[PDB]
Design an enzyme around this catalytic site. Structure first.
Site, PDB file in Angstrom:
ATOM      1  N   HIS A   1      36.387  46.117  42.264  1.00 54.26           N
ATOM      2  CA  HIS A   1      37.240  46.396  43.433  1.00 54.26           C
ATOM      3  C   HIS A   1      37.460  47.838  43.825  1.00 54.26           C
ATOM      4  CE1 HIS A   1      37.968  42.137  43.652  1.00 54.26           C
ATOM      5  NE2 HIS A   1      38.433  42.130  42.416  1.00 54.26           N
TER       6      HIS A   1
ATOM      7  N   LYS B   1      28.618  36.340  43.851  1.00 54.96           N
ATOM      8  CA  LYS B   1      30.059  36.253  44.005  1.00 54.96           C
ATOM      9  C   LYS B   1      30.271  36.007  45.498  1.00 54.96           C
ATOM     10  CE  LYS B   1      34.278  38.576  42.483  1.00 54.96           C
ATOM     11  NZ  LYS B   1      35.210  38.750  43.633  1.00 54.96           N
TER      12      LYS B   1
ATOM     13  N   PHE C   1      42.650  41.473  41.993  1.00 50.14           N
ATOM     14  CA  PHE C   1      42.847  41.672  43.430  1.00 50.14           C
ATOM     15  C   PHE C   1      43.296  40.351  44.057  1.00 50.14           C
ATOM     16  CE2 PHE C   1      42.402  44.619  46.894  1.00 50.14           C
ATOM     17  CZ  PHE C   1      42.399  43.768  48.021  1.00 50.14           C
ATOM     18  N   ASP C   2      44.548  40.301  44.509  1.00 46.81           N
ATOM     19  CA  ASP C   2      45.140  39.031  44.956  1.00 46.81           C
ATOM     20  C   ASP C   2      44.919  38.715  46.427  1.00 46.81           C
ATOM     21  OD1 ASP C   2      46.687  36.733  43.861  1.00 46.81           O
ATOM     22  OD2 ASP C   2      48.137  37.227  45.377  1.00 46.81           O
TER      23      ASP C   2
HETATM   24 CL   LIG Z   1      40.265  40.377  40.773  1.00 48.19          CL
END
Ligand SMILES: [Cl-]
Ligand SMILES: [Cl-]
Ligand SMILES: [Cl-]
Ligand SMILES: [Cl-]
Ligand SMILES: [Cl-]
Ligand SMILES: [Cl-]
Length: 128
Positions: A12, A41, A120-121
């Protein structure tokens, strides 16, 4: 072998590149960051800000995590990010991505000592 905090950085963080990602950015970055190993991904967000600025989010506004579990935090400021989304036509190992740069508040789950981003939401446009 990889810690949660390290995995977060690999997946990220992109501190040292331009905010307005070119159309090839996700193709190149998803490959370079090992997110197209084993499988494409499907979706991924990169954050074009200094590591310290992202880590500091852990001490910013506490908000509910998407799944209602863990401790999440929303950035005070809108950050430069890039969303990468696997193209419909892609099948592993051919992993092609659409690149979408934007500026958003990031929401990250934090944990540990030191208390650092591990997930990472979400991202959202609105401040508050
Ligand atoms: Cl994540
Ligand atoms: Cl910024
Ligand atoms: Cl998007
Ligand atoms: Cl889209
Ligand atoms: Cl939004
Ligand atoms: Cl949205």
């Amino acid at each position: 072998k990889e810690s949660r905090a390290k995995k977060f950085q690999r997946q990220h963080m992109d501190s040292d590149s331009s905010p307005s990602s070119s159309s090839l950015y996700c193709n190149l970055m998803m490959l370079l960051r090992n997110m197209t190993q084993g499988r494409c991904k499907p979706v991924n967000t990169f954050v074009h800000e200094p590591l310290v600025d992202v880590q500091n989010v852990c001490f910013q506004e506490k908000v509910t995590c998407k799944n209602g579990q863990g401790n999440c935090y929303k950035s005070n400021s809108s950050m430069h990010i890039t969303d990468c989304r696997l193209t419909n036509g892609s099948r592993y190992p051919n992993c092609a991505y659409r690149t979408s740069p934007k500026e958003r508040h990031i929401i990250v789950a934090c944990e540990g000592s030191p208390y650092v981003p591990v997930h990472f939401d979400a991202s959202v446009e609105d401040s508050t």
